[PDB]
Amino acid sequence: LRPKSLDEFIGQENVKKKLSLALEAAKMRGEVLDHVLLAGPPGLGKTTLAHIIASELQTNIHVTSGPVLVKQGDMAAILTSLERGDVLFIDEIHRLNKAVEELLYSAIEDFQIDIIDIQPFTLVGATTRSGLLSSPLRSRFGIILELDFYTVKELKEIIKRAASLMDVEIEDAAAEMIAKRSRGTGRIAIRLTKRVRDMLTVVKADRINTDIVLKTMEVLNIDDEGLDEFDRKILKTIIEIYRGGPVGLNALAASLGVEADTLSEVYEPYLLQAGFLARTPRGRIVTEKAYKHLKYEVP
Numbered sequence: 001l002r003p004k005s006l007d008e009f010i011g012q013e014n015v016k017k018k019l020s021l022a023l024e025a026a027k028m029r030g031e032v033l034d035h036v037l038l039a040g041p042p043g044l045g046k047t048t049l050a051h052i053i054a055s056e057l058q059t060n061i062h063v064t065s066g067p068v069l070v071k072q073g074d075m076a077a078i079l080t081s082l083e084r085g086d087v088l089f090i091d092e093i094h095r096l097n098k099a100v101e102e103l104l105y106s107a108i109e110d111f112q113i114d115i116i117d118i119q120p121f122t123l124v125g126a127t128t129r130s131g132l133l134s135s136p137l138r139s140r141f142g143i144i145l146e147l148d149f150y151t152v153k154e155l156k157e158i159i160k161r162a163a164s165l166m167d168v169e170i171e172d173a174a175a176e177m178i179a180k181r182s183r184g185t186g187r188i189a190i191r192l193t194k195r196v197r198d199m200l201t202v203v204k205a206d207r208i209n210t211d212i213v214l215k216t217m218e219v220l221n222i223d224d225e226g227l228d229e230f231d232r233k234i235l236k237t238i239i240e241i242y243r244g245g246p247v248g249l250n251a252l253a254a255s256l257g258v259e260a261d262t263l264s265e266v267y268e269p270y271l272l273q274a275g276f277l278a279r280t281p282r283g284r285i286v287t288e289k290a291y292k293h294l295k296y297e298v299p
């Protein structure tokens with residue numbers, strides 16, 4: 001269900017125009033595209049854009065991630081398999097250990113490594129937050145693209161596109177409802193569309209309407225604000241256990257039984273954006289909107 005070209009990519013206007021300028025120019029001159037850093041919460045299309053970059057350049061893409069490359073030998077094998085103009089896609093690039101990291105940095109300064117010459121290539125890194133990378137490495141990317149949450153309108157377009165490919169009809173009103181509950185994320189909108197499609201199948205309807213969407217949301221436990229089970233657990237934990245905050249990230253993560261990253265990089269971004277949560281020097285706090293939405297008496 002992923003697009004194959006920038007022209008097929010819906011949303012992320014700021015990112016597309018910047019990337020398109022560099023991409024088209026590099027192609028016209030037959031030059032190797034400058035290194036690109038994609039940053040933003042999960043499900044926004046960073047991986048999708050990385051593949052588009054290689055396809056537009058008509059080169060090969062090599063997918064990997066920091067957590068995987070633990071020993072220099074692993075990084076070496078990849079770099080040496082790169083053909084001129086190829087794209088080296090490193091997801092979770094900020095998770096590269098000193099060893100492999102130093103090796104990669106070296107290959108991008110003169111395309112050559114020692115425990116071996118490397119073919120000119122384009123490093124495309126992806127991270128949940130650009131600030132997570134070390135000062136040195138980040139200074140190597142000539143193109144930094146910060147993805148933002150999609151607007152309801154863009155999500156609706158994505159939802160309509162997804163439905164079309166799944167051989168299912170959907171009413172604008174229904175598409176709008178799903179978009180409003182997609183937490184600004186394209187991946188979520190598409191997955192909710194697949195689930196709503198299942199409801200259409202079971203109820204034997206001719207097209208997706210608001211009724212069908214509502215029924216699906218009830219089954220998936222997604223509220224009118226698009227919040228899921230865990231989103232509500234985060235807010236309720238702060239409200240009940242920490243009296244609304246402030247509560248530190250490490251303390252909140254331990255109470256929830258999840259890694260700190262899952263909160264700050266995966267769930268918190270939308271909660272902050274939508275005004276359910278706020279960050280202070282002393283820690284996270286819930287807003288009046290969170291109390292109201294979850295029906296907790298405003299203290």
Ligand SMILES: Nc1ncnc2c1ncn2[C@@H]1O[C@H](COP(=O)(O)OP(=O)(O)OP(=O)(O)O)[C@@H](O)[C@H]1O
Nearest residue numbers: 001003008009010042043044045046047048186187
């Ligand atoms: N025409 C399109 N069809 C499908 N998805 C599209 C389209 N145009 C843009 N997108 C975006 O591409 C993403 C596709 O979802 P997917 O789960 O593949 O994301 P991703 O690239 O893995 O995310 P990330 O790497 O940022 O975590 C969505 O964020 C979606 O909005």
Ligand SMILES: [Co+2]
Nearest residue numbers: 248249250283
């Ligand atoms: Co802290």
